[PDB]
Each structure stands twice: as structure tokens, then as C-alpha cells.
Design a protein around this nucleic acid. Structure first.
Ligand SMILES: [Mg+2]
Lengths: 49, 50, 147, 98, 74, 98, 50, 50
DNA sequence: GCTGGCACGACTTTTGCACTCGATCGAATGCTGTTGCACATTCAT
RNA sequence: GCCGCGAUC
DNA sequence: ATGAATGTGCAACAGCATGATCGCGGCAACGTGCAAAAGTCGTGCCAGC
């Protein structure tokens, strides 16, 4: 929520301004960039359900 | 920087771990290609040109 | 996005590494597989009627000699398309039991390690559902522009 | 892995056919070598040579399952330790129960 | 305020579940729908929950039964 | 609120003092060697420009005041504040875990 | 010629911003001995003997 | 045809990242088009190419 | 009667288009692990 | 998006 | 006595060598002619003051 969550940052800023102090986390953009980078090679990486 | 000339070295005597000290010579010029002489563990003259 | 290469090229992930995947899959050394990749030498396939072997490393001069003598029945290519052709023709399941029988029948500390490595790779490939022809890629993906 | 061998030995010995259990020989490896051989590829690819680990993970078609601490830190979920250990205990039962 | 949480820790001794219990109690007291059960001395909700735990008046079991009673009332 | 925070009126200072009251903040040094190299303190505002560190924790931090700098990370969640109070407070870890 | 001369004078391993705190820094920077540079050795390359 | 949310729903449940080789058909599945020109942007309009 | 924004018949610009020919370098870090190849040895006939 | 150079602990 | 298989030893190639800060500079790769369309310019138009 401090570094790479594009929606997490805004959500947690709104929560603090409201005064909620709720986590509501997500998925960092850095790992998505890494997944796109590896997929750009011949290796396929996906997230199983 | 290293002065151009002729430099002899012993390579500390620990390359093949056999205790055989190996003497090598270098010809460092101000400009151009290098030239080295190298002593094998089997006492063979090897020249490492450039 | 993607780009089509209009000709199959080889991936350096599986070619140039100390435990080369294509190296030990084809039972040929890294030097040979690198030489054929750059069109320096040819490799023939099939050729049961002719005296050429399945994985021959005949050079250019041997290529014209075979063409003059054997003529037809000699299927040799110089590019990575040859690697695709020989990789598709390989029957992984049939080779698995053949190498298993060779390993259990004859015992020797030298060939046992390489045989075990090849058997492990073959079993992993047949179990994982992958295919060996996918190592060398014909369509190359590209990174998104924002990255 | 000895942990994988132990459960197989216990399961085989639990049934009637106890002789199926296979004796093993424990091995010792250095830290640089033992770390790279872990059953999860997301870890051991963020410590040493990644070109080697990815291909040996690519051809095998393996899975990570995010069991250790390094994998969960990379993804950004709660690590299975300390305060986050309880949260990973609740999730395990739900997955097993369906 | 509580300079040390040892008194609260020994009430429910894990040093790890205490954090979760205090977080739940502070969430209840902060997002609304709850009032402190211990006199409030201008301090924040975190130390109020910790002092409730230390006094032995807030625990996981009784938190669950209070939630169940609230659900039953509604 | 933005404009008056930039203008830094006195009531903004009073509200900052109200917010700070019991929000633990955790300081750390650059080469975080062991787990005691990042500890959570309770901030007291000073009319100054440098962090004032307690002399006792210098041995744990391996910090001496000859130009040393430390980072100040703010735990901004209820779970994070409890973790920084019940696990990271300086009064909590007195015995070195070695 | 001008391109090479200006490239050497402006962007080189051994032509740096001069220190200007006190005359002492300028004095000790002008008469400075550097083992690095184009013909020199890399920082990682230097052993304990050098 | 309004009130559609895609940024929040982008966070999906997952577990056990899986890695495998990429098929050419699978690669084409990822791709949404083609690239045939080696230019990046045309300075005539300061816009991306075709 | 005086004045100021709309369309039409040539000029003028753009774009598909896919089609070709066209030296001078730094060389200098150990430390370890791995793989391949050459040679010495030993066993069989 | 770096590369060199200098500096602090 | 000699050939072949095996094990051992040696040489070449690959990865890797702390963390966090602050301050100054310097810094890459066309063409082609015509249809076909589109845009533009000089020109004439009605509607408001
Ligand atoms: Mg100091």
C-alpha cells in the first residue's frame, strides 16, 4: 500500500482522511511488471486460481 | 600508471597447487599490442600475444 | 503484441547454459548444436535407405558428396528449421522405455549419470504436458510500451 | 526432500504393505547449493542465478504454492509467521474443506 | 498509556494473538458502533484496547460471544 | 485543509500534537544487521532539526553521533501500530536474540 | 580535433569538479595522484598489494 | 450499459503461481495485434506510429 | 445602401504503397563449481 | 534513464 | 603381448563478491510517382445593420 498498489495508495489515503485506518490491500504493480517481462520471453507464467 | 617496459613476475607460485612457481614476463608498451611469455607447469614456453 | 520471425530461431535460454536443455535432449554436444545453428554444417534426418545416420553431422563437402551419390532420400537442412524437424520427429514415450532398458540392462558409473539425467528430463517433459519443439520460437512476443 | 520422504514412509507403513517403505540415505549440501534446490521456484530464483533456475523450472512446468516467507514477500501477501501466521492457518482449513 | 504490554500479554499469552485481538477491538471502537469499557484518559483507541485486555475485560472468546449476541439481537 | 497546512497556523501545530500523542513510529539505521536494528519509539516533538535518540539503544543500533542518520518510517494502520507497540517497542526487546 | 580535446577536458575519468571549500581543498586536489583512469585499473581490480 | 467497475475487480483471488513453456498459439493469444515497422514515433505529428 | 460570415470550381497537399539498392579496443579481481576431453591403467583374449 | 567523479556513516 | 574400456586428472567456461544516504557534470538512431482522397484557396452567395 505504500509502494506499488496503484489503487491501494488512493484507497488507504481516503481511509486515513476519513479516519478508518483500514488495510484494504492489493497486488503490487512491480510483480505485474515482472510477469509481463517474463511473458515477453519464451516462458509462460500465470496465476492459478 | 604502470610504466612501459619489461616486467617479470612469479604469479605467487600457486596456480596449479603443485608448488611449481611459474615465471612470466610482460612487454607493456605505451601504445600498441601487448606481448607475454609464460612458463607451463611442464616447463613449456608459451607466448600470449595480445 | 507479437512479431513473426518468418523463420524459426533458437532461444538462448535453452541453448547456451551449462546444463543445456537441447544439448542433453538430443545426445549431441553443445559445440555441434551451436555449429549447425549458424549454418556452418548440415544435419540429415531419416534416410533409412541411405547409409547416413539419424543424427549425422555431415559438413558441406559431405553434403555435395551425398547429393552426388545418394541423391534423393537425404533430408538435410542448415537452419534451426532442421532442429524443429528433428524435434517433432522424436517420440518421447518410445525413447523413455528404450533408455530405461539400456540403463537397467547395462550398469556403468560413467553412462549412468547422463542416462539418469536424460530419463529425468524425458519424464518431466512427458508428465508436464509440454512439447520439445517449443524451445525454439517462431513468434516472438514484445513488452508493453509503457514498461 | 526428507519431509516428502517421511510422509510417504509413514503412509506406506500405516497400510498393511509396510515393506513398500524405501530406506534412504541423508545428504548434506552447502548453503549456496541447498538454497537453490528448494521445491518452489519463486524462491531460489530471487537469490542466485535466475537464468538457470527459470529454465529448470520452465521445462518441468512446476508450481510455487507460496509456502515460505520469500515467496509471500514478493507477492505482497501476509507472510506465514508471527501475526500473519494465524491468517494463513485459517486459509489452509478452507482450502482443504473445499 | 501503556509503556509496556507485558501485563496485557500475560492475560492471553502469545504476543501474536494479542495484536490481532487489540486490532479487532480498536477497529470496533474506531469505525463506530462501540464504546470503551474502561475509562478513557484522552489516549488513542489502541492503548484503550490494550488496557481493556490487560484488565482482563476483553478476550477472544468474549469478543466472539458479544458478536454472536449482537447478531442474535438483530 | 491543504492550504492551511501549507500556511502552518498554530491550530495546525496543536492538531499535529493531538495526532502524534500515542502513534508509535519506528526508526532504523542504514546497515540493518540484526533484528534490533529497527525499533519503534513513541515520538516527542522537539523544536529542532535532528532526531534525538535514547543513549541506551545506541549499542543495539551500533550508532554513534558523528554524522549518523536514521530513517523514520510511520506505521499507519491499526494492525501496524499494534505490531510496532507490542513487538517493536524499545522497552519490549531488552535481551538480544543471539 | 576540437571534438576529441573537448571530450577529454569535459567528460573524463580524471577531470572532476574541483573542491572549493578552503584553499586547502583546492591545493590538495590540484596535486592529486590517481591510480584510476583510462590506462589505470578498476576499483574492484585493485588487490591488497596495490 | 454503465456502472462498470474494472479497476477494483482487477484484483482476483489466486494461489500457486504456475510456470511453463509458452506455445506460439498461446503467445498469439496474449498478443492483440502485430508489429511490422521499426520506427517508434513520427516527429511530423508527435504521435505514435501505425 | 453598406457590411460580414457561408458554399463551389479549380489548385495543392498528403498518403498508401510496397518496391528496390544500399580500426581501436582494453586487456590486469580471486574464488569456486561445472563440463568436456585427453591420458594412464587394468582387464580380457 | 543512466554513466562517470567526489563525499558521509 | 596388445586392444579396449574405464577412471582419473587437467583445462576452459559460467556466476559472484555489504547497506543506506548526499552533491556536480554529459549523455541516439531513406526515396517514388501516381491514384485516391482530402484539404485549401480564389471566387461568388444571402442575411444583418
Ligand atoms: Mg559513526
Amino acid at each position: 500500500v505504500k509502494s506499488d498498489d496503484v489503487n491501494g495508495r488512493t484507497k488507504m489515503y481516503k481511509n486515513i482522511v476519513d479516519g478508518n485506518h483500514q488495510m484494504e490491500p492489493g497486488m503490487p504493480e512491480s510483480f505485474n511488471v515482472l510477469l509481463k517481462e517474463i511473458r515477453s520471453l519464451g516462458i509462460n507464467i500465470e496465476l492459478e486460481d | 600508471h604502470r610504466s612501459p617496459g619489461v616486467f617479470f613476475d612469479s604469479d605467487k607460485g600457486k596456480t596449479h597447487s603443485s608448488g611449481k612457481v611459474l615465471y612470466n614476463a610482460r612487454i607493456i608498451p605505451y601504445r600498441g599490442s601487448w606481448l607475454d611469455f609464460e612458463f607451463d607447469p611442464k616447463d613449456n614456453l608459451f607466448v600470449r600475444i595480445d | 503484441g507479437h512479431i513473426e520471425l518468418a523463420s524459426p530461431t533458437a532461444h538462448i535460454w535453452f541453448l547456451k547454459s551449462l546444463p543445456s536443455r537441447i544439448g542433453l535432449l538430443l545426445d549431441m554436444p553443445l559445440r555441434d548444436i551451436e555449429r549447425v545453428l549458424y549454418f556452418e554444417s548440415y544435419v540429415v534426418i531419416e534416410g533409412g535407405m541411405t547409409n547416413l545416420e539419424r543424427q549425422q553431422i555431415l559438413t558441406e563437402e559431405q553434403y555435395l558428396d551425398a547429393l552426388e551419390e545418394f541423391g534423393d532420400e537425404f533430408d538435410a537442412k542448415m537452419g534451426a528449421e532442421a532442429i524443429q524437424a528433428l524435434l517433432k520427429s522424436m517420440d518421447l514415450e518410445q525413447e523413455c522405455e528404450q533408455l530405461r532398458e539400456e540403463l537397467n540392462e547395462t550398469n556403468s558409473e560413467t553412462k549412468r549419470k547422463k542416462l539418469t539425467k536424460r530419463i529425468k528430463l524425458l519424464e518431466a517433459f512427458v508428465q508436464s504436458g509440454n512439447k520439445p519443439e517449443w524451445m525454439i520460437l517462431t513468434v516472438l512476443p514484445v513488452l508493453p510500451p509503457d514498461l | 526432500q526428507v519431509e516428502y520422504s517421511r510422509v510417504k514412509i509413514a503412509n506406506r507403513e500405516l497400510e498393511a504393505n509396510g515393506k513398500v517403505g524405501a530406506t534412504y540415505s541423508r545428504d548434506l549440501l552447502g548453503i549456496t547449493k541447498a538454497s537453490l534446490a528448494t521445491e518452489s521456484f519463486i524462491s531460489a530464483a530471487s537469490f542466485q542465478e535466475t537464468t538457470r533456475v527459470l529454465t529448470e523450472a520452465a521445462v518441468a512446468g512446476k508450481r510455487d504454492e507460496l509456502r515460505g516467507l520469500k515467496e509471500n514477500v514478493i507477492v505482497g501477501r501476509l507472510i506465514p509467521a508471527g501475526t500473519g501466521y494465524a491468517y494463513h492457518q485459517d486459509r489452509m482449513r478452507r482450502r482443504a474443506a473445499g | 498509556a501503556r509503556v509496556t504490554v507485558q501485563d496485557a500479554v500475560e492475560k492471553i499469552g502469545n504476543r501474536f494473538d494479542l495484536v490481532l485481538v487489540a486490532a479487532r477491538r480498536a477497529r470496533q471502537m474506531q469505525v463506530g458502533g462501540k464504546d470503551p469499557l474502561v475509562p478513557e484518559e484522552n489516549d488513542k483507541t489502541t492503548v484503550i484496547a490494550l488496557r481493556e485486555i490487560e484488565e482482563g475485560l476483553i478476550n477472544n472468546q468474549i469478543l466472539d460471544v458479544r458478536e454472536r449476541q449482537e447478531q442474535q439481537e438483530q | 485543509a491543504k492550504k492551511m497546512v501549507e500556511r502552518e497556523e498554530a491550530v495546525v501545530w496543536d492538531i499535529l500534537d493531538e495526532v502524534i500523542r500515542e502513534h508509535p513510529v519506528l526508526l532504523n539505521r542504514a546497515p540493518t544487521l540484526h533484528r534490533l536494528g529497527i525499533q519503534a519509539f513513541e515520538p516527542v516533538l522537539i523544536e529542532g532539526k535532528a532526531i534525538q535518540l535514547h543513549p541506551l539503544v545506541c549499542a543495539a543500533y551500533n550508532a554513534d553521533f558523528d554524522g549518523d542518520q536514521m530513517a523514520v518510517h510511520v506505521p499507519l494502520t491499526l494492525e501496524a501500530q499494534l505490531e510496532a507497540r507490542a513487538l517493536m517497542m524499545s522497552t519490549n526487546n531488552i535481551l538480544s536474540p543471539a | 580535433i576540437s571534438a576529441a580535446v573537448k571530450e577529454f577536458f569535459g567528460s573524463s575519468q580524471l577531470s572532476q569538479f574541483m573542491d572549493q571549500n578552503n584553499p586547502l581543498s583546492e591545493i590538495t586536489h590540484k596535486r592529486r595522484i590517481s591510480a584510476l583512469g583510462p590506462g589505470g585499473l578498476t576499483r574492484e581490480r585493485a588487490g591488497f598489494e596495490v | 450499459l454503465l456502472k462498470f467497475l474494472k479497476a477494483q475487480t482487477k484484483t482476483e483471488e489466486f494461489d500457486a503461481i504456475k510456470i511453463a513453456l509458452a506455445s506460439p498459439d498461446m503467445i498469439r493469444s496474449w498478443s492483440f495485434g502485430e508489429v511490422k515497422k521499426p520506427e517508434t514515433i513520427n516527429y511530423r505529428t508527435f504521435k505514435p506510429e501505425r
